[PDB]
Amino acid sequence: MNIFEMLRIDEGLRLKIYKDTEGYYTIGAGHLLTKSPSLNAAKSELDKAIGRNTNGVITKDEAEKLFNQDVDAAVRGILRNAKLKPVYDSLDAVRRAALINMVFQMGETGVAGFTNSLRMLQQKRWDEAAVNLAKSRWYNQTPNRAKRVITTFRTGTWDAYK
């Protein structure tokens, strides 16, 4: 198991524009296109991302390319973030993937906001962090996914994904 396989299970890989859990236009493995209600705006953003007139449909390779870019950007966002970097540096390889997953889903700013959970993770207080992580909109809105990531932080294993 690795970060790509993990996110692929969590996000899937749709080749046609679709709406995410929040109702926003997205494509591929969770690649948000726009928060605007306009399909046209979405198609515009898509064509600009891919560099061709797509008509709302992309190929698998194109989807994977967006995926690779997005994982890369999440990692780099963490590394540049003053609140996130120290946490990431303190964790083992499995837990690092879990932090990447949250950043991928909610953005650096969003995760950087889990102040208390981050401190707990840094201190290696696993069960405490897991409880704190669950007290959030994130957990209430996407419980199954959140449970998988939390278990990953709690155990340091990939059991939730196997």
Q: Which residues are annotated as a binding site for substrate?
A: 32, 104, 117, 132
Q: Which of 11, 45, 62, 108 is catalytic?
A: 11
Query: If binding is defined by CB under 5 A, does position 51 make contact with Cl ion?
Result: no
Please say whether the beta carbons of 152 and 2 come within 8 A. no
Catalytic residue list contains 5 = no
Min separation Cβ 122 and Cl ion, Å:
26
Min separation Cβ 145 and Cl ion, Å:
4
Residue 157 CB-half CA count within 13 A? 4
Catalytic residue list contains 11 = yes
Amino acid letter, residue 129: A
Please say whether the beta carbons of 70 and 27 come within 8 A. no
Dihedral of CA 107/71/147/156: which sign? negative
Near Cl ion by CB under 5 A: residue from 6, 42, 49, 133: 49
Report residue 39 as tokens.
């399909």
Min separation Cβ 56 and Cl ion, Å:
16
Instruction: Using CB under 5 A, list all residues that contact Cl ion.
Output: 49, 142, 144-145
Active site residues: 11, 20
